Scaffold this active site. Structure first.
Site, short mmCIF file in Angstrom:
data_model
loop_
_atom_site.label_atom_id
_atom_site.label_comp_id
_atom_site.label_asym_id
_atom_site.label_seq_id
_atom_site.Cartn_x
_atom_site.Cartn_y
_atom_site.Cartn_z
N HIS A 1 0.79 -1.23 0.00
CA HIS A 1 0.00 0.00 0.00
C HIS A 1 0.82 1.27 0.00
O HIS A 1 0.27 2.37 0.11
CB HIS A 1 -0.99 -0.01 1.18
CG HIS A 1 -2.22 -0.80 0.89
ND1 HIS A 1 -3.15 -0.39 -0.04
CD2 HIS A 1 -2.63 -2.01 1.34
CE1 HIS A 1 -4.11 -1.31 -0.12
NE2 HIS A 1 -3.81 -2.30 0.70
N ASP B 1 15.93 -12.67 -1.06
CA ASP B 1 17.33 -12.59 -1.48
C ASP B 1 17.99 -11.25 -1.11
O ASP B 1 19.20 -11.21 -0.83
CB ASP B 1 17.49 -12.95 -2.96
CG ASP B 1 17.50 -14.47 -3.19
OD1 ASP B 1 18.01 -15.22 -2.31
OD2 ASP B 1 16.97 -14.93 -4.22
N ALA C 1 -8.88 -2.80 8.42
CA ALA C 1 -9.43 -1.96 7.36
C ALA C 1 -10.07 -2.84 6.30
O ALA C 1 -11.24 -2.65 5.96
CB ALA C 1 -8.34 -1.05 6.75
N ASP C 2 -9.33 -3.82 5.80
CA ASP C 2 -9.89 -4.76 4.84
C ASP C 2 -11.03 -5.61 5.43
O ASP C 2 -12.03 -5.88 4.77
CB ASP C 2 -8.79 -5.65 4.25
CG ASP C 2 -8.07 -4.97 3.09
OD1 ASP C 2 -8.74 -4.46 2.18
OD2 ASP C 2 -6.82 -4.94 3.08
N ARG D 1 6.06 -6.40 3.89
CA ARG D 1 4.82 -6.86 3.30
C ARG D 1 4.89 -6.84 1.77
O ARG D 1 4.96 -5.77 1.17
CB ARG D 1 3.65 -6.00 3.73
CG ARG D 1 2.38 -6.38 2.99
CD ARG D 1 1.15 -6.02 3.79
NE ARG D 1 0.82 -4.61 3.75
CZ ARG D 1 -0.31 -4.11 4.27
NH1 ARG D 1 -1.16 -4.92 4.90
NH2 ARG D 1 -0.58 -2.83 4.18
N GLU E 1 -8.18 -11.14 6.44
CA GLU E 1 -8.72 -9.84 6.14
C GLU E 1 -10.11 -9.89 5.56
O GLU E 1 -10.59 -8.87 5.08
CB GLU E 1 -7.84 -9.14 5.09
CG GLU E 1 -6.39 -9.28 5.31
CD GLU E 1 -5.61 -8.19 4.62
OE1 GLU E 1 -5.79 -7.04 5.03
OE2 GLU E 1 -4.83 -8.48 3.68
N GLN F 1 -1.91 -12.62 6.75
CA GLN F 1 -3.03 -11.71 7.03
C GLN F 1 -4.38 -12.34 6.74
O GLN F 1 -4.61 -12.87 5.65
CB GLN F 1 -2.94 -10.42 6.22
CG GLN F 1 -1.71 -9.58 6.53
CD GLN F 1 -1.82 -8.15 5.97
OE1 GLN F 1 -0.89 -7.65 5.37
NE2 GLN F 1 -2.95 -7.49 6.21
CO LIG Z 1 -5.20 -5.09 4.55
#
Ligand SMILES: [Co+2]
Ligand SMILES: [Co+2]
Ligand SMILES: [Co+2]
Ligand SMILES: [Co+2]
Ligand SMILES: [Co+2]
Ligand SMILES: [Co+2]
Lengths: 251, 251, 251, 251, 251, 251
Positions: E45, E84, E174-175, E70, E149, E147
Site C-alpha cells: 500500500h 534474497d 481496514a480490509d 509486506r 482480512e 493476514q
Molecule cells: Co489489509
C-alpha cells in the site's frame, strides 16, 4: 508567475511556515496539504540538490502552500540553477554585510539589474517559454530573503536593511547562538535580546522579518513583535518526536 | 558517536583500507563485510555527491569497517554538507600549505573553534537531535586528514604538521608524481624518496601518515616506515582486473 | 539489429560469459570492457527491474560483449517489457516442460508466431521506429534460452528440446542440486552426472547447452562436452573474494 | 579515445548540433540516433549534474553523434569531475577574458600543461586504466570551447583568440543580447552585427566559431560566415512546440 | 542471521511496531532510532519495490528495530526476490485459506521444505556467500506472518492455524471491516468482536496474533488479549497529523 | 477528487490526448502545459512502474490536462497499487471478453462492489486520509477504459459493452492489425472497417470509444464517427521526428 508569498510579505500578512529536511518529493506533497502558508526546501542542511528541489517544487505546485528554497551558500551559480528550475523565493544563508546582500539580490535579476544567466528555453521557470515576456516579468517576482546569523551580521544590519531588493531578513538562532558562545541553544537572554531587537529593527525599515523556531510560545512572541515569515516546526523533528513519544507510551 | 578510526590513529594502530569508487550503496555494503579497517568514499574522482555519500554511509554503518569521505575540494560548504549527513573522518585533497590545512580543520568545527554551520535538528550526524549534547561533543570526534600531493605541499609540510586539528597527512602518489614530471607513475626513485621521507617526517611529528598504493610490497614498506592509514586497493581496479584475468583464461 | 550472440550459438562458437548481479549501469560498463562474449543481467536473483535492465543495456551497447537478460519468471508480461527496452536474448528460469518452453518462445514473437504485444513507436527495441520493417524483422532475432533446474525438468528435456524456437537450454546447478537433495553441493557425483548427460543430450539435439559455474576446471569440462554458452564467474563473487583476499594479506 | 569532434573542427568541417536540456539518459539515446554531428549536455541551464552527465554519455556512446558538455561555470573542480566520467569536449560559459580562457584550458590538462587532478584508476575516461598510456594521451584529445556572452568578453576577444588550447569560441546570443540591453532577444541589428563580426574574427584566427540559434535561416547565415559548430535546436523546444501545435490542430 | 523478531514471538514477548509507508531509506533510518521493536516496510500500500525495500533494510540494519516486509501479494516470485535482498520476516496479505498459507510458507523455504529459488552468491541474504552454510541455516530463520482480512479468511482460521511454518496471523481491520460491510469503521461492535475472538483463538493455538491499529486504547486492549506483534501507528499519519495540528495552532 | 475526464466522457465531450512514453516526470510537466485534454502514462510499453507513475502524476497535477494510466496487464494487484498512488482513470490492455472487463472494473472498486484493497491512511489517493469519506466517495470517481485489440475481443464487444462500470472501450490498432495479419499496417481496409464499426457500435451503446492514431486525418475521421477519447500523437515520436527533420534540413 506572480509571487504570492512576496505579495503577502509586502502587504504585512504574516506567513506561517514548515521546514522541509526530509528531502523527498513524496513527504513534500503530504506536507503541502497540511495548511502552511510556506514551506522551506533546505539545500543547506538537508541532502538536497537542484534536482531534488525541482521534484519537490513539482510536488508542491498544486497546493496553496508557497515554496521557499535555501541554497547551501550565497553562490550565484547555484542560485542561477535554482531559479531556472522555478525557484522564486530564496533564503540565503550567512549573509554578513550589505555587499553580500547586494550580491544575493543581483544573482536573481537579469541584466541590467543583475547577473542572472539567461536560459529560458530550457527552464521550468518560464515553462519552457510558454510564459509570455518571461524575461521582462521575472525580476519583479523574485523574493530575496537574507539570513543574519553572526554577531558581525547583526552589526551590519542597518546597512543590509538599506539594500534594494532585500525583501526580508531572517534571523538564524542556531547559528547566531553558536557564534555568540551559547552553542547552539538560543534560549539564553542574550540571544533572545539580539533576536527581538533585530525583528523590531527589520520591520521598522519596511522589510519582512523572519525566523525559524520550534518553541511555539517564542514563535507567537516573535509574531507579536512584527515578524512576517515564521517557520514554526521542522518535518524531521515532528516525525521523530511523534514516533518516539508513541513508542514510549507502549514501553 | 565516538570516532574509532581517529582513536586508532592516535593509538598508533595501523588501519588498512580499501578505496570505493563504484559509487553504489550496494557494492559498498558488499565491501564493508570484506575485513578492512576503513573504506574511502571518493567524492573527488568517482561520481559521488552528498546524497550518494549518505546512502553509502547507511550501507556501511552496521559493519566494523569505518567510513572516510573525500570531498572534491577543500570547500567549507561541501564539508558542512558532508558532516551533516554523518561524515566524521575527512580526507581533503590538494592541501598546499598551513593556511589551507587550518581552513580544512575549521570547516569541521562549530564556533568558536571553527565555522561549521549549525543544523542539528536536520542532520543524520546528530541522529536528528537524539544524540544528547551533540553540539558539545561533535568537534572532538572529527578527524581531519589532509592530502599533500605537489612539490609545493611537500615544501610546506613542516608548517602543515604544526597545525592543530590535522590528525593525519596523506600522500597522493598519482598527483605527486604528475607534479614532479613522472605522470602519474610513482614508481620512480625520485617519487619514492619524497614519499618515504614524508612518511617518516609525518610520523615524527606525532601525526598519522597515510597513502593509497595498489602495489602490496610498497604498502608493506610504507607500513614499516610508520604509515598508519594505508589503502591497499581500489574497488574498480579489483573488479576490472579480476574480470579481465578470468576472461583471458578462457580465451 | 542482428543478434550476434544467437548467430554464434547457431554456428557452434562457444561464448564465455560473466554474470552481473551488481545491478549498476556503472559496473556494467566497467565489466563490458573486460573481454567476455556475453554478460547476464540477472532480474531473478539480483535487485533489477525493467528500468535498471534498460540502463545496463545502454551501458553495454558500445562494447563487443553481448547482453542476455534473465527475467524473474517465465512471465509473458515481464518478457514483453524487457523486449521493448531492447532485450533480444532471454534466459528464462524454471522451465519445467515443453508447454512452458513453448510459452517462453511465444512471448517473444509477434502474431501470428506468438503473443508479443505491439508498441514499436515507444520502444528502444525498434529505436523508436527508426529501424525499418522492425515488426517483420524482430521475431527472427529473438534468442530464447530456457533453464532446466529440477528433476522434473531433466525428465522432460527431450520434449523441451523438440520445441521450435528454443535456441538453448541452460542447466542451473544450484537449483538442480537443491532439488536433488544436495543443496549447495553441485560437486556431488549424481549431480555432475545429471549435468554432463544433459549437456551432451542438448548438443546432440542440435541446440546450445549452457551453464553457470564458478569452478574454472568444471567450466572447461563442460566446454569440452560441448556447452556453447558458459558463464565462468559472477561479478559480486569476483569483487567480494578479491577484496577479502586483499584484506587478509595485510591482516 | 581520439576526439573526432575536435578533429572535425580542426579540419574545417562544420558540425551541426542539438542542445539537450531534458536531462534524461533515455531521451538522450533517442536523440543520439537522429543524425546530428554533436549533442550538448547542458549542466548550466538544465537540471544535470556529474552523475546525469555520466549516464547521458553512456547512452550516447554507441552512436555517431559526439557529446559536448557544458559545466555550470568555469570551475576547475567541476571540470575535473566531468573529465573523469569521460567528457572530452567542454563548452565553458561566461569566459570574460584571456586569463579565464587560460584557466579553462589548464583545468583540462594534466601537469605540467595544466592542473587536472589525477585519478585514472577510478575514471571512465581511462576505462579504468584499460586505455594504455592514458595519462600521456589525454591532453591532446581535450577540446576546449569558451563562451563569449557579454560586451566585456567581445572587447577581449582578440586576446582570447591568442590563447593556446582554446579550440573554439561560442557566442551566446541570449546572454549577449541581455547584456547589450535587448533581453534576451538577439534578433536586433546591433546584436546580429556583434555576432557576425565575432564569427568572422574567430574563424580568421584559425579557431572554430560556434553558436546556438533556433532560427534556421540565421543558422545558415552563420554557417556561410564560417561558423563550425552550430546548434540548430533545443530538445525541450522541439518537444514543447510540436506538442502544442498538435493540440491546437484539434482545438 | 538469527531472526530476533521470530525468537521474540516464539518466547511470547510482545513486539510494538510502526508502519513505514514513506518509502524512503532516509525517513526509515530516522524512525529506526525511535525505539520500536519492529518496522513494517509496506510493499502493498506504499510505493515500494524490491529495490526500495533493499535500501530501507540497509538503513534499518544497525538499529535494534527489526524489519518486517509486506509484499504486494502472496506471490512466490516476489517473495523469492524480497528474501534474497535480505528479508527474513514477511507479512503476507489476503491469505484466505490453509492452501494459501502453505504456499506462503513454501515460498520462503529451500527444497525439499519449499520452492525458494537458489541464488546465494548474488544475495545480500547470505552476505554474498560470506555466511557459512547459509543454505542449511536459512529456512529456520524465516518468519511467516499471514493476514486474515475477510469473512472467508476468518472462517478458515482454524485450518490456517494448523499450517506448519505459519508463525503468526495478523488481522487487517481496514480490509476486514470493508469485507463485513463497515468500510472505514472497524470500531463497529461486530467488527471488534470478530477481531477480539480471532486474537484469542490465534494465541490459544500457540501462534502469534498481530494487528495494526492507530487508536492507542484499542492497541492496549489487543495486547491484553494476547496479541504479540502490534503496530501502533503509521509514519505518514504521524507526520500529516502533527503537521496539520501545528499549522492549526497558528491559524 | 471529482474525475473530470470521466464526467467529460459521460457528457459526450471529446477529449484529445497525447501518449507519454518518455517515462520522465520532467517531460511530463513540459507536456502537461501543451493544451491536451488528457495524457496517457504508459506502464505497458514504456519503462514505467508504480513509482514513476507517481512522480508523473505529481508533475501533471497542477495542469488542466487529465492523467490516464495504462497498467502492463489486467492485474488486480498492480491496479490496486496504481490506484493508491492516485490513479483514477485506467486504460486496461488486452481485455478479451466480458469476464475480463468485469475483473478490471472490480479491481478498481472497494467491497462490496469490488476487490480493491484498503490502505487509505497510506495513499496519495485519499491525500493520506485528508479527503473526508474517501472510502465512500472513491468508487464513483473511478473511470475504467478497456482495450479491445484482437479478433476475439472484437467478437465479444457486445458483451463487453454490457458490463457495468466499463466507461469506455479503446481500440488498439497496432495490436489489432497484428492479430488480423497486417502487422504495422492498420491502414489496410479490413482493419479500418473493423475499427470504424467498433467505434460506432461502442457509441451507440452509450459508452465512450477511444483510440490512439498518429495520422491526423484518421484521427479526425474517428472523432466524426463519435470517438470520445482520442490520442493524436506520442511524445517519443514527436521528439524523434522533429529532431530527425531538423538534422536533415542541415544535412
Ligand atoms: Co489489509
Ligand atoms: Co543557520
Ligand atoms: Co590525488
Ligand atoms: Co537457478
Ligand atoms: Co549563455
Ligand atoms: Co495495444
Amino acid at each position: 508567475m506572480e509571487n504570492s508569498f512576496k505579495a503577502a510579505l509586502k502587504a504585512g500578512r504574516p506567513q506561517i511556515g514548515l521546514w522541509l529536511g526530509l528531502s523527498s518529493s513524496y513527504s513534500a506533497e503530504l506536507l503541502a496539504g497540511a495548511g502552511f502558508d510556506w514551506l522551506l526546501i533546505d539545500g543547506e542542511h538537508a541532502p538536497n540538490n537542484v534536482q531534488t528541489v525541482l521534484t519537490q517544487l513539482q510536488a508542491i505546485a498544486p497546493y496553496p502552500s508557497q515554496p521557499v528554497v535555501r541554497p547551501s551558500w550565497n553562490d550565484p551559480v547555484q542560485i542561477k540553477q535554482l531559479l531556472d528550475v522555478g525557484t522564486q523565493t530564496l533564503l540565503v544563508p550567512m549573509v554578513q554585510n550589505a555587499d553580500e546582500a547586494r550580491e544575493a539580490v543581483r544573482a536573481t535579476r537579469y541584466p541590467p539589474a543583475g547577473i542572472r544567466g539567461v536560459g529560458s528555453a530550457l527552464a521550468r521557470a518560464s515553462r519552457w517559454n510558454r510564459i509570455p515576456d518571461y524575461l521582462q516579468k521575472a525580476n519583479d517576482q523574485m523574493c530575496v530573503l537574507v539570513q543574519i546569523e553572526t554577531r558581525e551580521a547583526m552589526k551590519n544590519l542597518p546597512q543590509i536593511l538599506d539594500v534594494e531588493g532585500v525583501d526580508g531578513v531572517f534571523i538564524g538562532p542556531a547559528d547566531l547562538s553558536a557564534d555568540m558562545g551559547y552553542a547552539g541553544n538560543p534560549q539564553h537572554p542574550e540571544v533572545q535580546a539580539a533576536i527581538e531587537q533585530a525583528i523590531v529593527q527589520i520591520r521598522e525599515s519596511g522589510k519582512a522579518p523572519g525566523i525559524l523556531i520550534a518553541n511555539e510560545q517564542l514563535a507567537k512572541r516573535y509574531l507579536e513583535l512584527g515578524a512576517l515569515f515564521v517557520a514554526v516546526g521542522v518535518d524531521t523533528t515532528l516525525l521523530a518526536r511523534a514516533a518516539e513519544a508513541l513508542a514510549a507510551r507502549f514501553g
